[PDB]
Amino acid sequence: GGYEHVTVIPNTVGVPYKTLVNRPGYSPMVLEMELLSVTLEPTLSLDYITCEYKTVIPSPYVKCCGTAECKDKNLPDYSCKVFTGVYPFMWGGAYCFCDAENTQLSEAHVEKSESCKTEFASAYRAHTASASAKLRVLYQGNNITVTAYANGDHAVTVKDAKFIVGPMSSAWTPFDNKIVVYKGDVYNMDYPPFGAGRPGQFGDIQSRTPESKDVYANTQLVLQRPAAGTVHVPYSQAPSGFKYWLKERGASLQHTAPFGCQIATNPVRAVNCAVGNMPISIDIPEAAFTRVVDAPSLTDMSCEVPACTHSSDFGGVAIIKYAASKKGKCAVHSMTNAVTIREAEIEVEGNSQLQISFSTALASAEFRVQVCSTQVHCAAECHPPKDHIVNYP
Amino acid sequence: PVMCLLANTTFPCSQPPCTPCCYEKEPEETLRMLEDNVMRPGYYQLLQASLTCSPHRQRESTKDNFNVYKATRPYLAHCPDCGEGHSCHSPVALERIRNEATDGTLKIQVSLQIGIKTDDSHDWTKLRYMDNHMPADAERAGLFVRTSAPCTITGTMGHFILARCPKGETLTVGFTDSRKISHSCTHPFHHDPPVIGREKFHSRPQHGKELPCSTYVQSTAATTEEIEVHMPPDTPDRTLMSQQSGNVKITVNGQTVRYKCNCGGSNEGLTTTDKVINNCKVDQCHAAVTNHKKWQYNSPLVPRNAELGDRKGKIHIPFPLANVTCRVPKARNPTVTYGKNQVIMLLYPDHPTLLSYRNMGEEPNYQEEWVMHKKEVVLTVPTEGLEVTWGNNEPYKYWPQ
Ligand SMILES: *[C@@H]1O[C@H](CO)[C@@H](O[C@@H]2O[C@H](CO)[C@@H](O)[C@H](O)[C@H]2NC(C)=O)[C@H](O)[C@H]1NC(C)=O
Ligand SMILES: *[C@@H]1O[C@H](CO)[C@@H](O[C@H]2O[C@H](CO)[C@@H](O)[C@H](O)[C@H]2NC(C)=O)[C@H](O)[C@H]1NC(C)=O
Ligand SMILES: *[C@@H]1O[C@H](CO)[C@@H](O)[C@H](O)[C@H]1NC(C)=O
């Protein structure tokens, strides 16, 4: 028979938050919580892969003293043309015995290049992402790591404390319905469907899977008449759409996405998107709590602030004097929301003093500090910092 | 058990009945057998066994001497520019230039064979090219690759060259023959390789940021990538025919010659012996040497063999494309000064460095610029925060106090 503590923290990674657990008839408990990572992994469905194409051109069939015939071959971008009145030459003279009536059959088709296994872009259909969170909790003087789906259903138990993370206040994702993945880079792209690729553009060659034998090709391959007395297969074709996309893609989602999203691959995911808030439910077990009577009683409390600087970090120092009934551990917490204390728990003993670190934005900070079950008023004159800009949240 | 086909029989691919020295015994028959198994999954097991020669009249075993170059040969093919803009039948003709490697390495295919001698033996200091009717030996040192300026050759094996080239609009591959005569082939090729990372640098660093990149591996081994091969077409040779008083005399010289005359009687035929064509003139005849004992790359610059149909073989090639790691330098951290919701950076780049920035809120407003020299940048830091990426360095994050 434990106690359920419910709180809400902003969805911001690298910011430690202090939460006061107050179970009636039990000594207050301070828990430090920090989001280590927030992962948004969408479900992917591979439509096709694209890469550099290869124009397969065999040796042309030069039929000496005869007419060659083109046949319809079921190959991607298959092109065939028979050229009449040819008289090709090799180093030792004319290849054909006849002066006239010689034909050259030029043939070509498109297939995946040898590079397609190494250099390729994948077209995915991205739908309904599952939100996951890694949370660091300073629990019983030790740091515990909780990894749970931020759906408000996935219960994760660490050291008998049951954690329920979420649901996320924002269902926002930096990924659109259709995405393109190239190595470690992800792009939001309304890519052409399979069998709709255009010449010289992304998808000029389309392969459903990287192992696929048959491919779609639309490269505008047109065979030309060979040069006088020359054996070769001249042609006109739109350059590689994949090579063109590689230089025209622009900046990836890692650089363009709002809310400071970090984009990773294998699997494709959005990491640390600073959007909305995250509710946290902690079912703290019975054994973790200490009764008020079993906890030290504090009296004759006084607070002095010898040094303070109002900044994003703990620029304030406070010395709190006390009279404790017995030796033991006391939770330290700020009763004013404008001031936050670095220390969550300190050891007390009789007529002694404690030193705490605090953070505030106020020039004149008047705050109350609750050490165990007794409150003390702190008066602080905080000074401005050296820099207007900082490199931490 | 992997099975291969020979006429009306099936046999284990690794064990053809012609063993040992299949090619040495019957070169035409071996190539025909290999062509018949081109679509079979055990083709490479058959290619390995058929092109390996460990004869009986030998003390030791040479069972690992598989040499594909015993079946293949260097050749002459069309080149649009052999020097001074004039086309020729080049012994260094350009077939295909591959530039899929993001590291900038070019995989070049030529009509000659590097690292192989005329006797098929492997020698890195040598090169074999087609000299008129017969292949000849040349020095590897004389081989050169150039675009707008000379290239750095990183690897050579058979028809393939690996080269690191400066920016250009053409690609030239050449060599110097036995007679000290230079031969070159120029093709129009736009070479301007894209930047690996976010910094345009000249020399390769020992240490830096590890970024994914592709290259053509310097390994001489041929296991993944492949090319199509087939028997060469008939080689025209006017020297085979001579005027015997007032008639035509075809001298074969121990070769198989296909001849055709614009005269009566036995005007055509595939002869192995000398033939005479009476009441005929030398200009009325056409003579060519047949090549059924050798293989040649399926070149679109060389005609197909008229006798055989769609008969073809396949051989593995060196230097396949593979995913590797490219080390990139990290630009020195700029001198940073602060102001109210503002960040000021004094950028000192040693080479072109990409500067990018975005707001960490709802409206990121992504902006980018390539910084060439000394430039002071004034950036607004919103309440949501600002993320700045300077070259290959990890992104800097800024927030107001
Ligand atoms: C493949 O064809 C060959 C030749 O036509 C067959 O072998 C010959 O068969 C005849 C009739 O039985 C014998 O008299 C000859 O001595 C055989 N010659 C040789 C060299 O074997 C052969 O049977 C066929 N192969 C299969 C597997 O059916
Ligand atoms: C629990 O984790 C926090 C965060 O990692 C630890 O806090 C500090 O650890 C180091 C102490 O010198 C510093 O290098 C960190 O900057 C600092 N971080 C913060 C946010 O204060 C803390 O020591 C851990 N506690 C235990 C008991 O392991
Ligand atoms: C190449 O990529 C594969 C994944 O497809 C990986 O297993 C391998 O380790 C990579 N090799 C290098 C050298 O990066």
GROMACS .gro file of N, CA, C and O in nm, chain B residues 9 12 49 92 106 125 151 165 168 174 218 227 236 255 259 265 336 356:
model
   72
  402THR      N    1   2.426  -3.316  -7.102
  402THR     CA    2   2.458  -3.364  -6.966
  402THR      C    3   2.457  -3.254  -6.858
  402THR      O    4   2.471  -3.136  -6.889
  405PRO      N    5   2.885  -3.159  -6.173
  405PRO     CA    6   2.910  -3.062  -6.066
  405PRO      C    7   2.994  -2.946  -6.119
  405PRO      O    8   3.099  -2.970  -6.180
  442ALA      N    9   3.722  -2.335  -6.177
  442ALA     CA   10   3.775  -2.466  -6.216
  442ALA      C   11   3.825  -2.472  -6.362
  442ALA      O   12   3.929  -2.534  -6.387
  485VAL      N   13   4.380   0.233  -7.579
  485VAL     CA   14   4.354   0.287  -7.445
  485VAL      C   15   4.215   0.356  -7.443
  485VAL      O   16   4.190   0.449  -7.366
  499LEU      N   17   3.745   0.806  -5.866
  499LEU     CA   18   3.689   0.770  -5.996
  499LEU      C   19   3.732   0.629  -6.033
  499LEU      O   20   3.850   0.595  -6.020
  518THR      N   21   5.438  -0.397  -6.263
  518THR     CA   22   5.523  -0.302  -6.336
  518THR      C   23   5.494  -0.303  -6.486
  518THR      O   24   5.546  -0.218  -6.559
  544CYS      N   25   4.615   1.348  -6.260
  544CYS     CA   26   4.543   1.278  -6.154
  544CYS      C   27   4.638   1.191  -6.072
  544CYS      O   28   4.742   1.149  -6.123
  558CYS      N   29   4.117   1.290  -5.902
  558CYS     CA   30   4.133   1.394  -6.003
  558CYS      C   31   4.092   1.533  -5.959
  558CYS      O   32   3.988   1.547  -5.894
  561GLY      N   33   3.757   1.932  -6.348
  561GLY     CA   34   3.774   1.934  -6.493
  561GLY      C   35   3.647   1.914  -6.574
  561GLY      O   36   3.540   1.889  -6.518
  567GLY      N   37   4.610   0.771  -7.078
  567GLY     CA   38   4.714   0.740  -7.175
  567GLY      C   39   4.827   0.655  -7.124
  567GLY      O   40   4.832   0.622  -7.005
  611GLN      N   41   4.083  -0.045  -5.273
  611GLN     CA   42   4.211  -0.070  -5.340
  611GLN      C   43   4.250  -0.219  -5.354
  611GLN      O   44   4.352  -0.249  -5.416
  620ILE      N   45   3.149  -0.775  -6.499
  620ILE     CA   46   3.132  -0.724  -6.636
  620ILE      C   47   3.095  -0.839  -6.730
  620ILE      O   48   3.134  -0.953  -6.706
  629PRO      N   49   3.922  -0.756  -8.945
  629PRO     CA   50   3.961  -0.734  -9.086
  629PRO      C   51   4.111  -0.711  -9.104
  629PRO      O   52   4.172  -0.635  -9.029
  648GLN      N   53   4.591  -1.957  -8.905
  648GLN     CA   54   4.474  -1.893  -8.846
  648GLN      C   55   4.346  -1.936  -8.917
  648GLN      O   56   4.352  -1.991  -9.027
  652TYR      N   57   3.661  -1.535  -9.541
  652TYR     CA   58   3.680  -1.457  -9.663
  652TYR      C   59   3.553  -1.452  -9.748
  652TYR      O   60   3.468  -1.540  -9.738
  658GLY      N   61   3.232  -1.896 -10.830
  658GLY     CA   62   3.287  -2.016 -10.768
  658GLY      C   63   3.287  -2.011 -10.616
  658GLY      O   64   3.199  -1.950 -10.556
  729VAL      N   65   3.355   3.411  -2.935
  729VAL     CA   66   3.214   3.441  -2.909
  729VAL      C   67   3.194   3.549  -2.801
  729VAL      O   68   3.246   3.537  -2.690
  749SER      N   69   2.552   2.719  -4.030
  749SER     CA   70   2.407   2.701  -4.029
  749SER      C   71   2.350   2.731  -3.892
  749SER      O   72   2.417   2.709  -3.790
   0.00000   0.00000   0.00000
